[PDB]
Each structure stands twice: as structure tokens, then as C-alpha cells.
A paper describes a structure:
The attachment of myristate to the N-terminal glycine of certain proteins is largely a co-translational modification catalyzed by N-myristoyltransferase (NMT), and involved in protein membrane-localization. Using coenzyme A (CoA)-activated lipid, NMT transfers myristate to the substrate protein, after removal of the initiator methionine, in a predominantly co-translational process (Ritzefeld et al., 2017, Schlott et al., 2018).
IMP-1002 is a previously undisclosed member of our recently reported series of human NMT inhibitors (Mousnier et al., 2018), and a close analog of IMP-0917 that was discovered through a fragment reconstruction approach based on hits from screens against PvNMT and PfNMT. With parasite growth half maximal effective concentration (EC50) inhibitory activity of 34 nM, IMP-1002 is 4-fold more potent in killing parasites than the most potent previously reported PfNMT inhibitor DDD85646 (Wright et al., 2014). For PvNMT[WT] with bound IMP-1002, Y211 adopts rotamer Y211c, allowing the π-π stacking interaction with IMP-1002, which likely results in the increased potency and selectivity (over HsNMT) of this compound compared with DDD85646. Consistent with the high affinity of IMP-1002 for the PvNMT[WT] this protein was stabilized by >8.8°C with 5 μM of IMP-1002 even in the absence of MyrCoA. IMP-1002 and IMP-0917 exhibited interesting kinetics: both showed a slow dissociation rate with PvNMT[WT], suggesting that several hours may be required for complete dissociation. Data from the PfNMT[G386E]-resistant parasite line were used to guide biochemical and structural analysis of this variant in recombinant PvNMT, providing both enzymatic inhibition data and the crystal structures of the WT and G386E variant with bound MyrCoA and the NMT inhibitor (NMTi) used for mutation selection.
Author numbering: 26 to 410
Write the structure that this text describes.
């Protein structure tokens, strides 16, 4: 690969290798005064659009763009189908900027053909806490691919982030770009065995017959942590302490405020599920997972694979295996077909015993305008939606 765009940017070259004595920007002493005040030029016939995600119709336009044009797996079997309510949650976190929700319209039809977004948060990288933008939902319509629109969207959002005196960003992608700070494979725990076989997600063999696969993945409908219950507003302070204390061990994590804990964890049906174990007025264990369906392309029977994605999980009164067993059970009780997790935090340590299967790819973690040492994904303590 030539990386003709990415090598113009303050990111490491593909062979760059920094040791742990280095943890700092590529470019420092930046000045808001010097940031370009003009919008980046689009090709003739296209215009920038300020998306108001709190407006149902603008939000539905983003939803349609992503439903038809967003991420597919490597074999083009599935396409993510984030719900409109999910997009509202993901994009309106504390202190979010409407002007960081950037659309591109094709003038002649007035239809949205491109999108990119960022939200602000404090990111701790190798013990240094930096205000960053978290970039997500970059999407160009399938009919306009490989026309160099993506670098325009990236340059325009960079400009708008810089106008807020923010000079670093965090982002994830499946493609390999210069240059990952970490790389985490994803794994899958079957819940609805027959459906997964019928859609070609899982496989059988002469030893693993259908009935044997169903028995293998069967789960007992009893929690190891008996009092695990849906999180409520009263639990925000305790989750903030429990999760915040846990995350400090990692090389990369968000430093959540109490307002951010309330936003990212208080349950929303079909969006975000958080369960807590309260003992003596203290939150001692937590489970959380978000809902991200994938459209099953071409399937006449099933429109979607209903998947729960592991978010943040902490235990102090059980083993991590027992906690994640309860997470799988809670996903099953909420009608999910599969439970998906990355090999971040303590997750990989339970994948064999809890009967996860390895997926077919990995999610790379990246920083913009930051040079530092890379690390194994068990040292990652952040999950991007
Ligand atoms: C401070 C502040 C800084 C703020 C900015 C920080 C950097 C942020 C980078 C963006 C991060 C995005 C995180 C995501 O949200 S993840 C999900 C990605 N969503 C999809 O997977 C949906 C399906 N897919 C698509 O919609 C399109 O394929 C895309 C992804 C829009 C790409 O458009 P297409 O038409 O292919 O490509 P064109 O417009 O010719 O642009 C080619 C250049 O672009 C680079 N690129 C491609 N995919 C990228 C990607 N996902 N993230 C970043 N860069 C990407 C690529 O390498 C190349 O540049 P070079 O020539 O190699 O230097
Ligand atoms: C099922 C299924 N459906 N689809 C459509 C796929 C790709 C799968 C495979 C299963 O992927 C995963 C499983 C996990 F446990 C955790 C993460 C992913 C994942 C993979 C690639 C990803 C994304 C998320 C995102 C979205 N955020 C993070 C930017 N972008 N990219 C390019
Ligand atoms: Cl129970």
C-alpha cells in the first residue's frame, strides 16, 4: 500500500516503532487561530450538511445511509444495522457538538450520501490524559466508492475538531492503516444455535451434529451473581467508582465523568443493557452490553442477526468467568442470538471455557497525532461502538 493520503497526516509510518519513553504528539503547540476557517471543497454537485441527530428526520436519514451502505464483514454476508435510537445515544454523549455530525448531500436529489462523526472525551494513553475526539460512523454511499471522498470527510472533521482546541483523536477500523496502537480479534458465543447454523454463521460436522451443538451451547437459566439487576440512576456514583477504579490499569481508556457514566450505562431497551450487583450500598460487580444487529444480506427468512456486544464488565465478588457467564445468560434472557466480544481487558481469559469461537478478523485501535508504544489488546480498556 502507498498510503498517499495517510502519509500526509500526523500518524506513524507503517514501520515506525516507539518505545515507552515516548508518549506525546507528533505536532505540538497548535493554535486555534491558524486553523482553516473555510470548509473543504467537495466535488461539483455535492454539499456539506449539518445533521441534527436530535431531529427524527435527520436521524432517519443517517439511519438509512448506514443501513444500506455501512460496514460489512469480509465475506459480505452481514451489514451492520445500528438502530435510529442507538445512533441518538451514540452521538449525543455529554458535551457533544452538533457541528461534529457531518453529512454530505448530493444536491440534485437532496439525499445524504456521506457521513462522519466525532464525540469528545478524555482519553488516558500510557497514563497521560488528553482531550480527544472519538471518530465513528464514517460512511460513503456504495455508488461513490474509491473516489477519494473519505479523505475529504476526514480532513473536514479534523478541521472542526481543531477549532475546539482539540488536536488528538481515537478511532478504530477493520482495515490496516498507519499505524495501530493495538489490534484485537473478535470472538462469538453462540446462543441461538439453530439460527446461527441456518444462516451459515456457525458450522456442524459428523461429530458435532445439530442436537450435540444445541446441547454444547445450552445455558442454565440461573445467575452466578444472584442479585444482578438492571442499573438505575441511584447506581451512577457506584458504577463510576467501580468502573473507574478498574480502568486505571489499562494503557488506553476513557476517563469517564459521572455524567458520562449516566449516559453510557443507564439502560435503554434495544440499545444498552447494564446490570449491577449491589451489596451494602456499594456496587461491587457490573455487566454491560449493547445491541447491534446485522442485516443478513439476501436472506428471505431472517432479516437480522440480533447480537449483543460486550461493553464493560467488572467483578469483585465472583470470578471473571462467572461474571461473563452471567453476561451471556442476560443476553439470552433479552433474546439475543449471539454474544460478541473483543480480546480486550480480561476477555480472552474466558473465551475457551465459555465456548467462544474465533471470528474472521480484527479491530485495530488508532490514535491521531500521537506517538507512543503499541501494546497487546489485553492492555486496551476502551470499546468504541
Ligand atoms: C484531531 C482530530 C482528528 C480527527 C480525524 C482522525 C482520523 C479519523 C479517520 C476515520 C476513522 C473512521 C472510523 C470508522 O468509522 S470505521 C467504520 C468505517 N466505515 C465503513 O467501513 C463503512 C463501509 N465503507 C465505506 O463507507 C467506505 O469504504 C469508507 C470507509 C468511507 C472509505 O471510502 P472509500 O470510498 O472506500 O475510499 P476513498 O474515499 O477513495 O478514500 C481512500 C482513502 O481512505 C482511507 N480509508 C479507507 N477506509 C478508511 C477508514 N475506515 N478509516 C480511515 N481511513 C480509511 C484509505 O486507506 C485511503 O487512504 P490512503 O490512500 O490509503 O492513504
Ligand atoms: C457480525 C458482524 N456483522 N458485521 C457487519 C461484522 C463486521 C461482523 C463481525 C463481528 O465484528 C465485531 C465483533 C465484535 F465482538 C466487536 C467488534 C466487531 C467489529 C468489527 C469490525 C468493525 C466494527 C466492529 C466497526 C464498528 N465500530 C467499532 C467502528 N467497524 N468495523 C469495521
Ligand atoms: Cl437467577
Amino acid at each position: 500500500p502507498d498510503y498517499k493520503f495517510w502519509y500526509t497526516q500526523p500518524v506513524p509510518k507503517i514501520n515506525d516503532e516507539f518505545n515507552e519513553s515516548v508518549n506525546e504528539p507528533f505536532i505540538s503547540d497548535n493554535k486555534v487561530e491558524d486553523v482553516r476557517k473555510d470548509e473543504y471543497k467537495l466535488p461539483p454537485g455535492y454539499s456539506w450538511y449539518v445533521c441534527d441527530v436530535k431531529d427524527e428526520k435527520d436521524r432517519s436519514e443517517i439511519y438509512t445511509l448506514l443501513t444500506d451502505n455501512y460496514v460489512e464483514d469480509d465475506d459480505n454476508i452481514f451489514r451492520f444495522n445500528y438502530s435510529a435510537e442507538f445512533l441518538l445515544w451514540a452521538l449525543t454523549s455529554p458535551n457533544y457538538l452538533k457541528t461534529w455530525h457531518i453529512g454530505v448531500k448530493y444536491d440534485a436529489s437532496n439525499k445524504l450520501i456521506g457521513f462522519i462523526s466525532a464525540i469528545p472525551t478524555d482519553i488516558c494513553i500510557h497514563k497521560r490524559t488528553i482531550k480527544m475526539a472519538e471518530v465513528n460512523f464514517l460512511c460513503v454511499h456504495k455508488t461513490l466508492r474509491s473516489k477519494r471522498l473519505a479523505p475529504v470527510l476526514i480532513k473536514e472533521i479534523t478541521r472542526r475538531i481543531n477549532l475546539e482546541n482539540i488536536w488528538q483523536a481515537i478511532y478504530t477500523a477493520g482495515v490496516y492503516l498507519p499505524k495501530p496502537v493495538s489490534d484485537a480479534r473478535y470472538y462469538h458465543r453462540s446462543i441461538n444455535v439453530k439460527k446461527l447454523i441456518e444462516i451459515g454463521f456457525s458450522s456442524l460436522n459428523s461429530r458435532l451434529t445439530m442436537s450435540r451443538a444445541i446441547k454444547l451451547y445450552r445455558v442454565e437459566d440461573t445467575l452466578n451473581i444472584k442479585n444482578m439487576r438492571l442499573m438505575k440512576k441511584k447506581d451512577v456514583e457506584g458504577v463510576h467508582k467501580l468502573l473507574g477504579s478498574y480502568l486505571e490499569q489499562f494503557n488506553l481508556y476513557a476517563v469517564f465523568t459521572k455524567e458520562e457514566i449516566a449516559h453510557w450505562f443507564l439502560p435503554i431497551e434495544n440499545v444498552i443493557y447494564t446490570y449491577v450487583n449491589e451489596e451494602n450500598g456499594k456496587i461491587k460487580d457490573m455487566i454491560s452490553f449493547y445491541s447491534l444487529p446485522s442485516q443478513i444480506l439476501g436472506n428471505d427468512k431472517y432479516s437480522t442477526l440480533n447480537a449483543a456486544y460486550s461493553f464493560y464488565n467488572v467483578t469483585t465478588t465472583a470470578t471473571f468467568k462467572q461474571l461473563m457467564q452471567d453476561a451471556i445468560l442476560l443476553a439470552k434472557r433479552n433474546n439475543f442470538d449471539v454474544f460478541n466480544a473483543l480480546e480486550v481487558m480480561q476477555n480472552k481469559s474466558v473465551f475457551e471455557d465459555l465456548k467462544f469461537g474465533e471470528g474472521d478478523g480484527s479491530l485495530k485501535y488508532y490514535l491521531y497525532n500521537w506517538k507512543c508504544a503499541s501494546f497487546a489488546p489485553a492492555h486496551v480498556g476502551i470499546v468504541l461502538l
